[PDB]
């Protein structure tokens, strides 16, 4: 009953992977994308927030 948690479990290198880091980044991207689609973000705060986070 010992499943070894590995780097693949944390994150595989692909952008669309199923790693925890990957999916957290994806949900952050979705929230920012909706914010930009509404008239509330320019295309530069989008990058600033992500890089900070």
């Amino acid at each position: 009953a010992v499943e070894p948690i590995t780097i693949a479990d944390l994150t595989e290198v692909k952008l669309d992977g199923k790693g925890a880091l990957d999916q957290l980044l994806q949900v952050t991207r979705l929230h920012l994308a909706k914010e930009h689609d509404a008239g509330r973000l320019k295309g530069q705060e989008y990058a600033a927030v992500l890089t900070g986070g």
């Binding site: 530069q44 705060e45 600033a48």
Partner: protein
Amino acid sequence: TIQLKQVIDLLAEGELSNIKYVNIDTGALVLERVPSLIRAINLGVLDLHKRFLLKEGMLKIQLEEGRRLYPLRPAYQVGQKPKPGVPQFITEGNKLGRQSILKIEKIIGDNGVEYYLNDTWQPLNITTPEFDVLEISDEFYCHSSSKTLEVRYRRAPTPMKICVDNLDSWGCIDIDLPYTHLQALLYFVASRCQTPIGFMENTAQEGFNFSQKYEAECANLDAQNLRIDPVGNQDRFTRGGWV
């Protein structure tokens, strides 16, 4: 007055290297936003032709008694498409395009006389009501003695048509400029392209800096006098009386 598009893009690589337009982050090589780049370059060329003469054209209108308005549009010009509802009276001159007439400057009759343009109350005045049309009053016909007209105007080149099959080469396209205004065109394009990108203190000012350099270069070209400039020397001594 031509330059290969290839050299233009190769050089603009050296100033657009920061951004998406020309570079993959790895092994920087030109992308396929070339359509957008060309659409920007055409605007730049038009702006430079606005700022300096660099060109002038000619036409030849065959008059028709009783006519009031003569529009100068590419449907009335010989060798163009003959729309049935219009008589093709522009019988000679540079091929007309959508942006060719920036300003009409001279009107010369068949006799060598020189008519007046937008000079009210002058003897035989010719008025332009809509910037591309000549309004000819009836007094002109009353005292004309001229069966044709010759028009000169400030030109801007007609950009070459890109095509989806033409995406193969894109290097046979020829921009119509002298090389000096090429050096200026580089800054123009770089400013327009770099304006809407960047969020750091020093990276938010590149568009402004390139605008400043563009203006400085235009001033330098004006100082060096690398454009056409007629200068008038009338006679004043043959009218009979000044001698």
